[PDB]
Design a protein around this nucleic acid. Structure first.
Lengths: 63, 209, 97, 145
RNA sequence: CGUAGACGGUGAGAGCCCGGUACGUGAAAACCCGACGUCUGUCUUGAUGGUGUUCCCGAGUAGCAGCGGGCCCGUGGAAUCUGCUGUGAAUCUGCCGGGACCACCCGGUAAGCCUGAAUACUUCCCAGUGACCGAUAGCGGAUUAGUACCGUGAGGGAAUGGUGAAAAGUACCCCGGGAGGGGAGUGAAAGAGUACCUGAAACCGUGCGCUUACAAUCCGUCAGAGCCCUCGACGUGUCGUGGGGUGAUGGCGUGCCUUUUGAAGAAUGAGCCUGCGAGUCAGGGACAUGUCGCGAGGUUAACCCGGGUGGGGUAGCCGC
RNA sequence: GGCAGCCAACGUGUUGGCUGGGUAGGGGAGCGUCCUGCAUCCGGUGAAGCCGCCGAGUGAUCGAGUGGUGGAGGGUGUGG
């Protein structure tokens, strides 16, 4: 039985060239009128997964 | 370059066979040969050892008695593992023990075993094992005694050499195989390795070309 | 089973090794023969008396059919030319055993 | 000689199985599981986080699409070309595969900034600007085929 | 000398004692696949390769709509396939598919069609194999076994192997109603007696040694008086580097396990012994830690061949 | 006096000196059992098992020491 990858984790996380798992940031989907553009710029782009969550996110991506 | 003088059963001596260094002068690797031999024995192993789990043991479907009141331990099946006659929890089940040892590992282990035999001068070459078309274990035994005195000898002869195979097969420690099936387990198990000339040339061609 | 009743055999194994005797009974179902004066047993038969020295069936393996010359011999076969019969033959002298 | 009884695993190769739950001198009783709980009798799923929105559900799904028609290329660098062909000569997909610079059946894209110093007739599916510049400076010929 | 040391049996490890084994080989009859026959439709009775314009040629089907099924596709932009309901196309300038459509196009010619062998499985039969079990195991079933027994019934469902090489299975006598014994005999051995291989523990005695009826004991442990045997100075019982027990008496001493902040706990479990009873296996699964091969390469999967564990197999996968 | 990591040494690195209560738990190293490849030994001149004696090891435990019973297998080494 092949280890199935977690669909949600695969859709929410990516690995860079060096293997860094990257993710997008929450609170940037709607309710944006009250959010200053500095906040949305902070929430923009991709950030490396926190070391605490890295183990479980790797588990979900690999199997 | 290592040389093996072809010995004829007649007592005379035909020419000699060169042993390629890449095939008979390799440095034996104990760990590699051990892994290859263990994989060979695992492949040989017939994993037909089986038991019955609690679900496979007959009966046991019904709960033996009430959950409460009887004053006895709670049971859900008379075939639970703790029960006498119940199923085996983690008992053997049929399994294939063979391993997918890499081709390079297998070939290198065989070449190292044959190299050890060559370095210790345990490799012999013979035109044939008996003169004539009728097999003769007497003649084969005399010729093998002439060649070597060690108990176990791996006889590597061609498939068409049925006369030699039949002649030599019933000797207690002699093991007979073909050059294409040559393998580290047999090479190491045998004190000496007696190639036929055709078998040795076939092995060298197959491993050099 | 190459050992029949009425043919004398040599006990080649057992306590009575080297003793000749005529086969009284054959037991192919269990590969045993009752040889005369071989494998004596002191049985406590009621009869009032004491022990009687009977014969116990010895395994057919422990005997060899005696050759015409008196020597033990393995039993082979030869197909006759008159009737096509297969007569027992002795591996030693090749005579009708 | 080396017989079968002379074969041993490599030092540090084999390690004893941790046979758990065999007396208190080893990982006994609870077998390393500790006292009561879920984990005392089973494995907690990896995606479970105690009931709070898991990370893989509170984080937004990565933006974009995958483009099932994408034309990805197997890349070769002119530095690898130099290492593989110090004398020069024609270069194409066949000999790139032979030298082990690209996959056997793929769209090869040549490229590079690693000081191409050999006149080479390189024929790949595509080239980069620096690939063409390096080929020309070295005196070779880039061909898209 | 064995072209036959496979495996068993035989009074204990047998290639040469026996069944056999490698291999001299064998079928009247019956049943399975081969060659030649009788037997079975189509032609020479102008087609057969070229010529050429025009007419005719597979339906309640395709399509569509509603509601469903199934496809990665959970109705979604929803294609292809399909059930039911309704409505319903011509003849190649046709029709269908390429996940709408002019179509540049390509592919194919459904519904009237139908029809082939080459891959799964084992009740049963034959020959085999096992780093499988070995009588609480292995099939429930080595034994009357789907039996006894239980249940109205469906159904549930056991326990029970070993004398000895050979019954040679203890004649005869004695005690005893017998049972069971004691002589005697058989046997290598009855320390093998149809209650039978070995014969553990629990448990139950009998004999001997020490101890114990003023004593408050988690039953032990540390001292320890007093009561027998192994070597000797000495010549004879008191010593010893010595060597086991039994324990007057003194000190200390709150079972084990589980589970708890915490249990000797008046919290849980255990009457005892023996046997059994719980992190195991599958998968190029995933993540981390010694070895082959590289030199950027490692590998093969299915599969093919080998009487094996061996040789091929580049598809793919991972690095790049 | 006896046993368990680090340091110095000059040379083969095994000697000396600085080191350790433990539940969950982690790591390391081992004892015993069975089955096995190969090697090699013991065994009806008595294997295993069982009951002891005498001892032994830091532990699991040991017994190619030994007595009794026993009657056919077993030990050791290195691997699986």
């Amino acid at each position: 039985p092949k280890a199935k990858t977690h669909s949600g984790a695969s859709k929410r996380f990516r690995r860079t060239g060096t293997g860094k798992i990257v993710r997008q940031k929450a609170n940037r989907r709607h309710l944006l009128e009250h959010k200053p553009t500095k906040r949305t710029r902070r929430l923009d782009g991709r950030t490396t997964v926190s070391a605490a969550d890295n183990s479980r996110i790797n588990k979900l991506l690999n199997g | 370059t290592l040389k093996v003088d072809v010995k004829t059963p007649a007592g005379k001596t035909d020419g000699s066979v060169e042993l390629p260094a890449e095939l008979f002068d390799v440095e034996p690797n104990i760990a590699l040969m051990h892994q290859v031999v263990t994989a060979q024995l695992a492949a040989k192993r017939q994993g037909t050892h089986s038991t019955k789990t609690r679900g496979e043991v007959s009966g046991g479907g019904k709960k033996p008695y009430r959950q409460k009141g009887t004053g006895r331990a709670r049971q859900g099946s008379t075939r639970a593992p703790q029960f006498t006659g119940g199923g085996t929890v983690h008992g053997p089940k049929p399994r294939d023990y063979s391993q997918r040892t890499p081709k390079k590992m297998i070939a290198a282990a065989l070449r190292g075993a044959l190299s050890d035999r060559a370095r210790n001068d345990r490799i012999h070459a013979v035109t044939e094992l008996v003169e004539g078309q009728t097999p003769s274990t007497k003649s084969a035994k005399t010729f093998l005694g002439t060649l070597t005195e060690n108990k176990k000898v791996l006889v590597v002869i061609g498939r068409t050499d049925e006369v030699g195979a039949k002649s030599v097969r019933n000797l207690p420690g002699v093991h007979v195989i073909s050059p294409d099936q040559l393998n580290t387990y047999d090479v190491l198990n045998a004190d000496d390795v007696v190639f036929s000339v055709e078998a040795l040339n076939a092995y060298i061609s197959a491993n050099s070309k | 089973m190459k050992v029949h009743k009425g043919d004398t055999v040599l006990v080649i194994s057992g306590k009575d090794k080297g003793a000749k005797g005529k086969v009284l009974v054959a037991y192919p179902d269990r590969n045993k023969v009752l040889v005369e004066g071989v494998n004596r047993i002191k049985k406590h038969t009621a009869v009032s008396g004491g022990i009687v020295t009977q014969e116990a069936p010895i395994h057919v393996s422990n005997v060899m059919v005696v050759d015409s010359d008196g020597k033990p011999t393995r039993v082979g076969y030869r197909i006759d030319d008159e009737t096509g019969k297969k007569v027992r033959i002795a591996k030693t002298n090749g005579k009708d055993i | 000689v080396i017989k079968l009884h002379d074969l041993k695993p490599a030092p540090g190769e084999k390690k004893a199985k941790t046979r758990v739950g065999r007396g208190e001198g080893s990982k006994g009783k609870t077998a390393g599981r500790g006292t009561k709980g879920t984990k005392a009798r089973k494995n907690v799923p990896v995606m479970f986080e105690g009931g709070q929105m898991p990370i893989h559900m509170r984080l937004p799904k990565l933006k974009g699409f995958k483009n099932r028609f994408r034309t990805e290329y197997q890349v070769v660098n002119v530095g690898d070309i130099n290492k593989a062909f110090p004398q020069g000569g024609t270069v194409g997909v066949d000999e790139l595969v032979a030298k082990g610079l690209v996959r056997k059946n793929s769209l090869v894209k040549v490229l590079g900034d690693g000081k191409l110093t050999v006149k080479v007739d390189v024929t790949a599916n595509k080239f980069s600007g620096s690939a063409r510049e390096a080929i020309t400076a070295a005196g070779g010929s880039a061909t898209e085929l």
